Amino acid sequence: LTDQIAKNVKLDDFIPKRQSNFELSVPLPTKAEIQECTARTKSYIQRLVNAKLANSNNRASSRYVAPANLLLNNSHHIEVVSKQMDPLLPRFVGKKARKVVAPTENDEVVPVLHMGEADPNEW
Amino acid sequence: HRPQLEARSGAKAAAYTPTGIEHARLLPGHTTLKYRK
Amino acid sequence: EHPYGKEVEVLMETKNTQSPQTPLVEPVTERTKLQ
Amino acid sequence: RGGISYDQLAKLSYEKTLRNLATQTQNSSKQDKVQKDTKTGKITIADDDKLVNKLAVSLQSESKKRYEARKRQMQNAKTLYGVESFINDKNKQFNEKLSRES
Amino acid sequence: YIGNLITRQFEGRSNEIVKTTTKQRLDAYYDLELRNSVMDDILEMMPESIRQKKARTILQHLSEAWRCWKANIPWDVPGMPAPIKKIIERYIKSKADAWVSAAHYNRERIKRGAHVEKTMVKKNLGRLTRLWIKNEQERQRQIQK
Amino acid sequence: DILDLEELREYQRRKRTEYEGYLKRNRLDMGQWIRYAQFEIEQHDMRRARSIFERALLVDSSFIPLWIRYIDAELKVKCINHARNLMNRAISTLPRVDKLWYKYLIVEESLNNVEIVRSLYTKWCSLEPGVNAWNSFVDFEIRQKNWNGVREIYSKYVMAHPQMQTWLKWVRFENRHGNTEFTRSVYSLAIDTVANLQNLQIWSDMEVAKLVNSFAHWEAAQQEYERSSALYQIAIEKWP
Amino acid sequence: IVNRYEKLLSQRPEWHAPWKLSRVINGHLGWVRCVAIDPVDNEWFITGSNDTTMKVWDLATGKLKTTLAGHVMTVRDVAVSDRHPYLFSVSEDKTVKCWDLEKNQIIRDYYGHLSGVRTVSIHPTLDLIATAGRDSVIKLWDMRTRIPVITLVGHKGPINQVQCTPVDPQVVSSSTDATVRLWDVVAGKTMKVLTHHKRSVRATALHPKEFSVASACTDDIRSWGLAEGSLLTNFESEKTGIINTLSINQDDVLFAGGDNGVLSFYDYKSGHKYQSLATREMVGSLEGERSVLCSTFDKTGLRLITGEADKSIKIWKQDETATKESEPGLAWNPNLS
Amino acid sequence: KEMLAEARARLLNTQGKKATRKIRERMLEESKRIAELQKRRELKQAGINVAIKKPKKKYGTDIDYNEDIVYEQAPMPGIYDTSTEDRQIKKKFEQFERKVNRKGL
Amino acid sequence: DEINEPPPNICEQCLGDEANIRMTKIPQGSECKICTLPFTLYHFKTSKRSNNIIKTLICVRCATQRNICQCCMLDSRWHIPIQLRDHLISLVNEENVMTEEAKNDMMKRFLSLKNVKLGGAQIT
RNA sequence: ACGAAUCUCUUUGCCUUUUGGCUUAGAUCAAGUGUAGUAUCUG
RNA sequence: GUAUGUAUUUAUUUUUAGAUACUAACAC
Ligand SMILES: [Zn+2]
Ligand SMILES: [Zn+2]
């Protein structure tokens, strides 16, 4: 049953790896590996920024910027189409400032793992 | 009923819905970066 | 001075060299503009 | 002389409850498993209803005793020291903390 | 403008509203950063346990040491762990230097006589009289020694 | 006081609005959380109490009294399995805090189940906590039998705390139980490990002195002056 | 477990040379909170201050080039850019100001922190900024459009120190809840948590090569491998507390600035401490004012620059005599932990 | 003796203008509660049953803590699979409320 | 991004016998009938010429948690009212699996954000 | 004879209802005055 | 020549003189 009890925490997390052999080499992350993370991250951030600059109230700010649905078994397919808003009416009919308390969903526990008498008379 | 004892976590403000008011200082300015050699 | 006294240069700086307008990073002009 | 770190203290309390428990066992002598489903990993452990009630009663009892003793120190604490001037109870208590600081 | 007026009229005003530091609320923020910065240190020197009681207490000792620094009173606590006294002496020396430098700066701004607020004149006067008396007491003590 | 149901119902609403007011304003001040959960217990409603506690932990999990009262809230209402799951959460959060492990141990032994405490202490040993834990663990086995086991336990223990008084406890066990055969062999097992690794220098000289005197002196108690003086004599050679 | 202790006695680590004091520069009115160095030419410093200014010192002679004002309160952090001619400064006034090194004037202001912002780090390849402070969140700013693109919710307290890395975890952060998180920004959630510190982690530094980080606390300076997120090593430290800053030379020397004024140099590989110094306070200072607020090495790594709480910058040079005659430091005795 | 009595009066009170006011205002509120309660008891003695009122809503999103679990944080999942103890609990709880409807605490 | 990315959940029933369908997507529509938070809305018409118009009421989250259809609000598989399927399931076992729901506001506004997946849903 | 338990009291340990911010100490400083509503003290 | 705050449920949910007084947008 020993497996179940403190199942998460385990010894080898407390012990440092380089103390066995110094000079055990942690490689810096090559080159063509960073040219990847840089690519995907760059694209993602562009998606956020362009996603924002087309939101807000400036016909000015937009100059600095697919059926796609197989529903269920795809039987009925679909075609998805945006609707042009009456420019006067509010775009985003449902955007309204409201405050929300989010829950904190804790799936697992992160063990907090660390390694007076006369002292109080000092402190 | 006085002083801070804490600060406000930005986490809270992260979950709210945006208003979309347009401020004066976020109007586009210095719109082009500069790269070194 | 004496707190260090030998090798150490104790220098007290006020005012400025390099009048404030100077670029502090030189703009690279690739072409030479005669205009 | 002295303070005690929160570890040694923890050990001492553990020992204390061990002694108390062993006395319940001896006096009880004087008066006279693990199954885990395949479907879910939920473990189940057979229990005696006795000793569980005895446990709850032990916890409640000790809480009562602590609460009472502290309460008596409440009573004596305020009735002992009438020397200096005080506006309210809380003042007197604060100044007794000043007596502890000496 | 009217964009903001109406989008605020349908969608309500923003709940976040962070608010910047300006001429009026500056000193408050300076206080605040300071008391926090002392909390960190004096929590990290201590060996283990106690926080909130000793928090409020130690920060009170800060305030009292500041007042006693304005009044030129030496501020010894009859007993107190030395390292904490090192720390509080440090931060109060810091705040002192900032305060003095603000007094000089505002004075030499008034000598030119350019847009000083009605109160800043009064306050600045106060800081200068404090400083002047400190110079006086210094001169007298140094004459005794 | 309260009369009918709808009377009580308000008495809940009001108190709760006061509480969650003061907790709305102060996320900290755990006293208030503890008293509030305590209230929802005195209303015989557990679910609410548990929610209150869980929140109080999401705020701060490093304040143990909160943990302990949240355990005893489940025990006192005779809900055990909850007080188990809660424990594997607790110690797994804070494996260094001793009070947690000891508490879970006691709660297990008051239920007489000795296998769970056995595997428990095993795990609590694997993390190499310190002398108090191990000592409490052999003092566990003494309440049991495991005279075969307690040897293995001391084995692990002396490998994880290579100091004299650990070995001195080891032999003091046998001599307390008087068995001579193993005693001699183990006294041998200490000294040759000393001189074997002694170049590694961790054992202090005075330590060596106290260890020699124990084995030689005890052999003198066994009337093996030949053997005793033999040992002591080798010790002269191996040392300045 | 003794087997580990033997395996600590085989290595006999990594000789280095001691350090000494080359130069003292007065000239700030308040404390010196932060220091950064021109990443290309090594021609200068930018030093924050507690007087709100920033004074650009020449590295060669130590003379003062220019002064950059513009913040109303103390400047906790300063960071200069590689690819750009930009300087991002950040303060307790809730604001992150860009600076165009060409014309020496504020270009942009980034807005949106709730309170004082104690750290800026400039992502190497993305044209981002990472800022953090008592908000308890890390804000990833788009450098061009001043839009706080991503926000990283996480630590349960203030955030002291933040770093950026080109591959995974692209942001490393350290907070007063005594943790260090390794972030995955695209998904926007913690990739790994490192809890091993017992108190506020007040300083970190990235090794310029090995792709690891050195984290600090009161008495214990650990190291951490990135990628996997393993522990790598520990560093031998009796009470040095409090560790205000760390800096890693290209030679695998790990500096540790004290609040007791002690300069504790380490080898990075081993964990050994080969030197400890004590600074001289100053002519009229207090014994309390002797401490080390920040520090860095030049691009070479043969000079060290430490702002101190005595209102002075000190420049520590590595001795050229040294070798084995008498360098030897404390000489590698691994006490039991 | 007059100014001494007055001195004795001022030195013993630290309540303050706002604090004294909140004490007395709280007394007023509790009095109002007592009044409404005994109203309901008297009307009950005549058989007419009237429910208590919720004190409106200060602001739009205001919460009534009685009506629902405020923020329900599940304790966790866990290996020991309680699932029985919950039954005994609910039995004890419904027992409690089923008592209050009669003996009335 | 977060709101768009999950695709809609629609029954095959109410979506009609037409082979290919044109549906409109509004990036902020009404709030849920449930959680009271914004989301993305979808028109469509069963027939091309049918006068009646179908409008997804609830979120994707507030649906997925309950495992129902956004237009119908019937169970995604059995085409059953939520208040029923949990009664059938509750018939097996004994007493459980009732879906407890969210009075006040930020009770519900809160609740929709957790990943729980609901009492009723888990069996289906 | 000592081991063990309950109750009571005293001493040590733990602190229990035991001072929660900044600015020019944040600034200032009395018989003060007439009449009037209402409380109540004495023959 | 007081902000501000609380409450405003009507239409019926199944079983003998005055002294010491407090105060007053009321009279320098
Ligand atoms: Zn919804
Ligand atoms: Zn449908």
Side-chain angles (χ1 to χ4, degrees):
Chain A
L1 188 143
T2 306
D3 297 346
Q4 299 307 319
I5 182 154
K7 185 182 178 61
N8 192 25
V9 61
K10 62 180 65 152
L11 182 55
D12 59 354
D13 294 345
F14 303 167
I15 66 102
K17 297 198 167 166
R18 293 158 75 91
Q19 277 188 339
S20 66
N21 57 339
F22 304 172
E23 188 62 16
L24 177 140
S25 183
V26 185
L28 54 80
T30 67
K31 176 61 176 147
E33 180 60 18
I34 74 175
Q35 290 183 338
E36 176 58 19
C37 290
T38 288
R40 60 194 299 269
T41 298
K42 186 160 191 153
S43 164
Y44 172 77
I45 279 173
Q46 290 304 318
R47 290 177 43 207
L48 283 171
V49 169
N50 289 343
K52 183 177 299 301
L53 290 187
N55 291 343
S56 67
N57 287 338
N58 278 343
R59 59 198 176 78
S61 176
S62 62
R63 82 180 68 155
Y64 294 126
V65 301
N69 284 276
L70 283 67
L71 183 59
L72 301 170
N73 55 346
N74 191 29
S75 178
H76 296 292
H77 291 83
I78 264 170
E79 180 183 344
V80 157
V81 174
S82 300
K83 177 177 175 296
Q84 72 288 0
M85 295 293 96
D86 188 6
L88 269 37
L89 272 60
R91 185 175 53 186
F92 304 152
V93 66
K95 179 168 71 182
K96 184 177 302 171
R98 60 176 68 77
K99 61 180 63 144
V100 178
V101 291
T104 61
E105 192 169 353
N106 51 351
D107 298 344
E108 294 200 335
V109 290
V110 289
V112 178
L113 50 93
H114 311 293
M115 291 305 292
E117 294 171 13
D119 296 348
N121 294 336
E122 299 302 322
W123 293 90
Chain B
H1 49 80
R2 316 277 187 275
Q4 186 161 197
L5 302 174
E6 192 179 10
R8 156 162 277 247
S9 289
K12 297 175 175 205
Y16 297 154
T17 61
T19 300
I21 288 168
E22 176 201 352
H23 291 290
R25 304 192 179 157
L26 303 167
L27 291 178
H30 296 282
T31 316
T32 179
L33 286 167
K34 277 186 289 218
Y35 293 94
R36 207 199 288 261
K37 188 185 168 171
Chain C
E1 184 267 332
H2 184 58
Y4 315 122
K6 301 297 177 61
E7 295 155 19
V8 183
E9 317 166 16
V10 185
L11 54 81
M12 172 67 179
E13 292 301 315
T14 60
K15 300 175 164 64
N16 290 135
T17 59
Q18 184 160 344
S19 66
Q21 189 148 16
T22 58
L24 195 145
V25 160
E26 181 202 359
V28 178
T29 57
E30 192 279 335
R31 301 201 155 87
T32 60
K33 293 149 199 286
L34 273 58
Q35 202 144 30
Chain D
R1 194 169 161 279
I4 302 176
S5 295
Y6 281 101
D7 290 344
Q8 296 177 5
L9 191 139
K11 183 169 175 292
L12 297 179
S13 180
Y14 176 68
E15 291 180 353
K16 185 180 179 63
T17 56
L18 285 180
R19 289 180 296 97
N20 182 28
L21 187 146
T23 62
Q24 284 200 351
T25 58
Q26 285 200 348
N27 292 339
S28 63
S29 64
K30 295 172 183 173
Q31 291 176 339
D32 294 343
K33 295 169 191 177
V34 169
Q35 294 81 3
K36 290 185 293 202
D37 288 348
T38 302
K39 182 58 164 187
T40 59
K42 307 293 283 197
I43 190 172
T44 60
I45 287 93
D47 294 344
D48 50 352
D49 292 348
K50 292 183 162 65
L51 275 65
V52 176
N53 298 337
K54 309 306 183 180
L55 172 56
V57 171
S58 63
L59 299 174
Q60 290 176 353
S61 296
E62 289 179 356
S63 62
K64 292 291 158 59
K65 293 183 175 67
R66 294 169 180 161
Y67 179 89
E68 293 303 318
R70 177 61 190 89
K71 177 174 205 163
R72 188 159 69 258
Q73 191 158 27
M74 289 287 187
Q75 297 304 319
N76 291 338
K78 65 181 183 299
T79 58
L80 290 173
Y81 186 75
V83 175
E84 183 183 0
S85 297
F86 304 112
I87 300 167
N88 63 34
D89 186 1
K90 191 178 293 293
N91 301 343
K92 180 182 63 55
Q93 196 58 59
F94 175 81
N95 294 333
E96 295 188 8
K97 186 177 178 292
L98 294 176
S99 68
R100 178 61 178 179
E101 293 298 322
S102 65
Chain E
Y1 293 0
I2 303 162
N4 288 334
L5 174 57
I6 286 166
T7 62
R8 187 178 80 207
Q9 202 66 63
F10 293 108
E11 307 173 352
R13 61 170 54 73
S14 180
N15 310 122
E16 49 162 14
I17 303 179
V18 319
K19 53 172 52 196
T20 190
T21 177
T22 60
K23 185 55 160 70
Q24 83 181 29
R25 70 175 75 81
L26 193 143
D27 61 9
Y29 292 160
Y30 178 81
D31 170 29
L32 205 141
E33 305 307 348
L34 183 150
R35 294 182 69 262
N36 184 33
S37 174
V38 166
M39 278 301 290
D40 288 345
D41 296 343
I42 293 176
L43 286 179
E44 294 179 17
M45 292 303 296
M46 291 178 187
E48 50 176 329
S49 60
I50 189 68
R51 180 190 294 276
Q52 69 285 359
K53 303 301 288 191
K54 299 299 172 295
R56 298 189 195 286
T57 298
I58 186 60
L59 268 47
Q60 288 174 332
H61 289 288
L62 191 147
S63 296
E64 173 66 9
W66 174 242
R67 285 163 199 137
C68 295
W69 181 86
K70 284 190 209 158
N72 195 31
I73 304 166
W75 187 70
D76 292 339
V77 179
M80 183 174 273
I84 282 173
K85 191 167 174 191
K86 308 303 284 185
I87 281 167
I88 287 172
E89 290 304 331
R90 189 167 85 162
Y91 285 89
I92 282 172
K93 169 62 175 173
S94 170
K95 179 174 178 182
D97 298 348
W99 187 84
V100 173
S101 65
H104 298 298
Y105 171 77
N106 284 331
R107 193 62 178 175
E108 294 158 22
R109 178 180 188 80
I110 291 176
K111 288 178 65 58
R112 297 182 296 168
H115 184 276
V116 65
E117 310 192 336
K118 171 58 174 48
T119 59
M120 291 307 297
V121 181
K122 188 194 301 300
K123 294 182 52 204
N124 180 34
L125 185 145
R127 295 186 177 176
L128 282 177
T129 180
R130 290 302 180 105
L131 295 178
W132 182 79
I133 290 171
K134 278 209 184 141
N135 281 344
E136 187 62 16
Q137 294 176 340
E138 291 306 323
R139 180 172 67 80
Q140 289 187 337
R141 284 207 305 271
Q142 290 190 20
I143 282 163
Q144 286 191 331
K145 292 162 207 173
Chain F
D1 289 345
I2 295 172
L3 279 42
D4 55 350
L5 188 139
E6 298 307 319
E7 183 67 15
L8 180 142
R9 193 67 66 188
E10 294 305 317
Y11 175 72
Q12 292 186 338
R13 174 171 295 108
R14 185 182 68 263
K15 294 299 290 187
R16 291 181 188 178
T17 56
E18 297 176 26
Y19 287 133
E20 295 191 9
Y22 287 86
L23 301 178
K24 179 166 142 192
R25 258 161 278 129
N26 289 277
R27 161 196 300 283
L28 307 168
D29 186 7
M30 292 306 179
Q32 191 66 60
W33 289 98
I34 282 169
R35 285 171 294 179
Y36 169 51
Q38 187 57 54
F39 167 82
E40 288 299 323
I41 288 168
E42 295 181 4
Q43 298 301 316
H44 299 287
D45 187 0
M46 291 304 294
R47 191 163 143 214
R48 287 186 184 274
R50 291 165 184 181
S51 292
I52 296 165
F53 285 109
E54 296 302 325
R55 291 163 59 189
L57 290 168
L58 297 173
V59 171
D60 189 357
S61 60
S62 66
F63 186 87
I64 60 183
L66 179 55
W67 288 96
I68 292 165
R69 285 174 188 273
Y70 174 53
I71 303 155
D72 298 354
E74 292 301 325
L75 294 174
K76 293 174 179 160
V77 299
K78 298 174 196 162
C79 294
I80 183 67
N81 290 336
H82 290 287
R84 293 176 180 278
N85 286 332
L86 171 58
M87 290 292 79
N88 298 348
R89 192 174 73 198
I91 66 177
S92 61
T93 297
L94 300 182
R96 297 310 191 174
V97 178
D98 294 348
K99 178 63 174 188
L100 293 174
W101 292 92
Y102 284 146
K103 186 167 184 64
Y104 186 47
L105 293 167
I106 294 162
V107 171
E108 285 300 325
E109 291 188 359
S110 61
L111 300 183
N112 279 345
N113 196 337
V114 293
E115 182 61 14
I116 292 171
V117 302
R118 184 168 295 110
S119 67
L120 180 29
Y121 273 107
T122 293
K123 179 62 163 173
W124 167 229
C125 289
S126 296
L127 277 54
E128 302 157 348
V131 291
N132 282 339
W134 296 102
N135 291 337
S136 59
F137 176 52
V138 303
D139 290 346
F140 168 78
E141 292 303 333
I142 290 172
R143 294 190 296 279
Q144 301 304 318
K145 294 179 179 183
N146 292 341
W147 305 93
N148 292 336
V150 64
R151 294 184 187 85
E152 182 66 19
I153 294 165
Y154 271 102
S155 171
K156 306 296 190 180
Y157 173 61
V158 297
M159 289 207 50
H161 289 283
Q163 303 151 10
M164 176 185 73
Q165 70 293 355
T166 56
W167 296 102
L168 185 62
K169 286 177 186 296
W170 205 117
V171 295
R172 183 177 173 79
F173 174 81
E174 292 301 325
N175 293 338
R176 185 184 302 280
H177 294 84
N179 189 339
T180 299
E181 297 182 8
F182 296 160
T183 300
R184 185 185 297 276
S185 60
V186 169
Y187 270 99
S188 176
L189 181 56
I191 186 64
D192 55 357
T193 52
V194 175
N196 186 342
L197 295 181
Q198 182 56 257
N199 194 30
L200 174 137
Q201 194 58 59
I202 58 102
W203 292 283
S204 62
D205 189 5
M206 289 305 169
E207 176 176 11
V208 177
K210 272 67 189 191
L211 173 57
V212 171
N213 297 339
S214 178
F215 174 59
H217 190 282
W218 175 80
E219 290 300 328
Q222 291 301 314
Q223 298 302 321
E224 297 301 321
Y225 300 135
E226 178 278 335
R227 189 180 178 84
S228 178
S229 297
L231 169 75
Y232 194 89
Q233 187 62 60
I234 285 106
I236 288 109
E237 175 209 21
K238 299 293 291 204
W239 289 91
Chain G
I1 77 165
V2 178
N3 287 339
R4 290 181 296 168
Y5 194 84
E6 276 90 8
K7 292 178 194 303
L8 287 177
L9 291 177
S10 70
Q11 283 77 355
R12 186 155 300 98
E14 296 304 322
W15 177 90
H16 288 86
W19 293 86
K20 66 186 177 169
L21 183 63
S22 62
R23 184 173 304 157
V24 174
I25 299 168
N26 290 335
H28 273 283
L29 295 187
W31 292 2
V32 167
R33 303 305 298 272
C34 57
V35 166
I37 188 157
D38 182 355
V40 175
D41 283 345
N42 292 338
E43 294 304 322
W44 41 268
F45 300 159
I46 295 163
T47 297
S49 176
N50 206 33
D51 69 10
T52 71
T53 60
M54 289 185 288
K55 288 181 184 287
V56 173
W57 298 97
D58 188 356
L59 176 52
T61 65
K63 300 304 173 195
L64 173 51
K65 290 181 184 295
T66 187
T67 305
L68 299 176
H71 289 294
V72 298
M73 296 171 72
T74 194
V75 179
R76 297 302 294 278
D77 182 7
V78 163
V80 181
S81 178
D82 301 345
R83 292 185 298 178
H84 306 285
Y86 292 155
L87 160 68
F88 301 135
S89 66
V90 70
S91 179
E92 289 290 326
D93 65 8
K94 303 170 180 178
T95 55
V96 184
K97 287 176 186 306
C98 175
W99 285 87
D100 184 2
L101 292 180
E102 298 177 347
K103 306 166 199 163
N104 293 344
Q105 293 310 314
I106 290 160
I107 294 307
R108 305 163 191 174
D109 294 345
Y110 306 95
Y111 163 84
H113 281 278
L114 296 156
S115 63
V117 184
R118 287 186 293 189
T119 302
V120 166
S121 183
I122 300 170
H123 189 286
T125 64
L126 282 174
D127 291 346
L128 282 177
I129 289 170
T131 55
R134 297 170 66 247
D135 293 336
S136 303
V137 295
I138 296 167
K139 283 181 162 293
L140 295 179
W141 296 103
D142 183 2
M143 190 175 297
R144 177 166 143 275
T145 69
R146 297 170 300 171
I147 288 173
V149 176
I150 301 166
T151 294
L152 295 176
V153 176
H155 315 291
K156 293 196 183 172
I159 290 168
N160 289 323
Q161 187 67 254
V162 178
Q163 297 298 328
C164 293
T165 56
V167 286
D168 282 344
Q170 295 187 335
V171 173
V172 182
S173 62
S174 55
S175 60
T176 60
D177 67 351
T179 64
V180 171
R181 281 181 170 75
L182 300 178
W183 292 98
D184 181 5
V185 300
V186 178
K189 65 199 173 187
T190 295
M191 171 173 174
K192 179 63 170 158
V193 183
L194 305 172
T195 61
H196 304 182
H197 293 280
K198 200 145 61 164
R199 292 180 157 167
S200 175
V201 175
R202 194 180 283 198
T204 66
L206 293 180
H207 188 277
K209 297 162 190 193
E210 293 300 320
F211 184 72
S212 68
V213 68
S215 170
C217 182
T218 56
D219 293 338
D220 194 3
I221 298 179
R222 293 190 170 78
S223 176
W224 302 92
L226 273 68
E228 295 305 321
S230 179
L231 176 60
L232 291 192
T233 190
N234 283 278
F235 290 82
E236 302 304 323
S237 304
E238 187 273 341
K239 276 68 177 177
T240 58
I242 296 167
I243 299 300
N244 280 344
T245 185
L246 299 184
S247 302
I248 296 165
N249 183 23
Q250 297 176 336
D251 293 347
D252 298 340
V253 173
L254 171 62
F255 178 86
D259 280 345
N260 48 347
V262 172
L263 302 185
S264 173
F265 296 84
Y266 300 154
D267 172 67
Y268 180 74
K269 298 287 190 280
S270 69
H272 176 57
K273 177 168 75 174
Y274 74 89
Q275 188 178 356
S276 306
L277 295 171
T279 62
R280 189 60 51 77
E281 49 183 348
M282 197 60 75
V283 175
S285 60
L286 302 170
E287 184 171 13
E289 288 184 339
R290 180 174 62 260
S291 63
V292 176
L293 301 178
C294 54
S295 71
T296 188
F297 296 111
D298 76 350
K299 183 185 182 178
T300 67
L302 304 174
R303 278 174 208 274
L304 175 65
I305 298 103
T306 62
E308 293 181 350
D310 58 357
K311 305 170 181 177
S312 67
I313 300 180
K314 294 189 169 70
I315 294 165
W316 298 93
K317 176 184 180 167
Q318 192 169 1
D319 185 68
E320 297 80 355
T321 300
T323 62
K324 68 161 210 307
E325 292 87 353
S326 296
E327 178 272 329
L330 282 65
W332 188 244
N333 292 335
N335 286 339
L336 273 75
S337 182
Chain H
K1 296 175 179 178
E2 294 180 353
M3 69 189 85
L4 189 147
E6 181 178 3
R8 183 184 296 274
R10 183 184 301 174
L11 292 174
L12 289 225
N13 284 242
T14 86
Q15 291 198 332
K17 171 205 259 199
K18 255 259 187 235
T20 59
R21 226 173 101 227
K22 293 301 182 183
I23 286 171
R24 181 175 178 273
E25 289 180 351
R26 185 169 295 107
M27 295 297 182
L28 295 178
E29 181 177 0
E30 293 302 321
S31 64
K32 297 174 181 177
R33 293 183 61 251
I34 294 170
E36 179 64 17
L37 298 176
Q38 293 181 336
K39 283 288 187 64
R40 182 179 180 273
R41 294 182 185 174
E42 296 305 320
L43 299 177
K44 179 181 292 296
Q45 294 301 319
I48 296 98
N49 291 281
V50 174
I52 308 300
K53 273 68 180 180
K54 294 176 294 298
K56 196 188 296 296
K57 291 180 179 297
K58 295 292 185 65
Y59 54 93
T61 61
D62 185 3
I63 301 168
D64 184 4
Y65 298 97
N66 182 35
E67 183 66 14
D68 184 1
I69 306 300
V70 180
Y71 300 138
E72 185 177 2
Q73 189 68 61
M76 274 296 291
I79 187 170
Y80 288 88
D81 188 46
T82 62
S83 66
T84 61
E85 298 176 353
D86 294 344
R87 294 181 180 176
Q88 297 176 336
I89 290 172
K90 293 177 180 177
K91 181 176 76 180
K92 183 178 68 65
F93 179 82
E94 294 176 349
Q95 183 172 355
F96 172 80
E97 291 177 348
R98 186 175 66 251
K99 295 297 284 186
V100 178
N101 280 333
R102 299 179 65 251
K103 292 180 67 65
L105 189 145
Chain I
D1 285 350
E2 300 82 352
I3 300 171
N4 294 337
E5 292 171 348
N9 183 344
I10 306 295
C11 70
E12 195 139 25
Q13 293 302 322
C14 186
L15 193 134
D17 296 341
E18 184 63 18
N20 199 330
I21 281 170
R22 182 181 297 275
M23 72 169 68
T24 297
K25 181 181 181 179
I26 299 168
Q28 299 293 324
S30 180
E31 66 282 9
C32 263
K33 290 301 196 158
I34 294 174
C35 81
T36 310
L37 267 77
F39 68 94
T40 55
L41 187 72
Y42 290 94
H43 300 165
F44 62 92
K45 288 177 175 182
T46 58
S47 69
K48 173 44 187 253
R49 196 92 282 136
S50 161
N51 49 191
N52 276 331
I53 191 138
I54 319 271
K55 181 165 57 145
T56 60
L57 300 175
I58 63 172
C59 267
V60 57
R61 299 191 304 281
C62 303
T64 300
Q65 293 186 338
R66 307 165 184 270
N67 195 28
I68 64 178
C69 182
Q70 292 181 334
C71 67
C72 293
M73 294 183 75
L74 297 172
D75 193 351
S76 65
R77 295 195 54 182
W78 303 343
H79 300 289
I80 281 177
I82 303 167
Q83 194 159 333
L84 180 66
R85 153 261 303 203
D86 57 357
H87 183 278
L88 295 190
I89 290 170
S90 67
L91 191 53
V92 176
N93 188 33
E94 291 303 322
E95 292 300 323
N96 196 26
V97 85
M98 295 296 293
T99 63
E100 294 82 2
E101 193 175 353
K103 296 296 294 197
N104 298 128
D105 286 349
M106 53 205 84
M107 301 292 95
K108 57 179 76 172
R109 183 175 300 184
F110 167 89
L111 176 146
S112 69
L113 273 56
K114 63 176 67 172
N115 210 226
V116 270
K117 172 50 147 226
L118 203 280
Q122 314 146 263
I123 73 81
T124 34

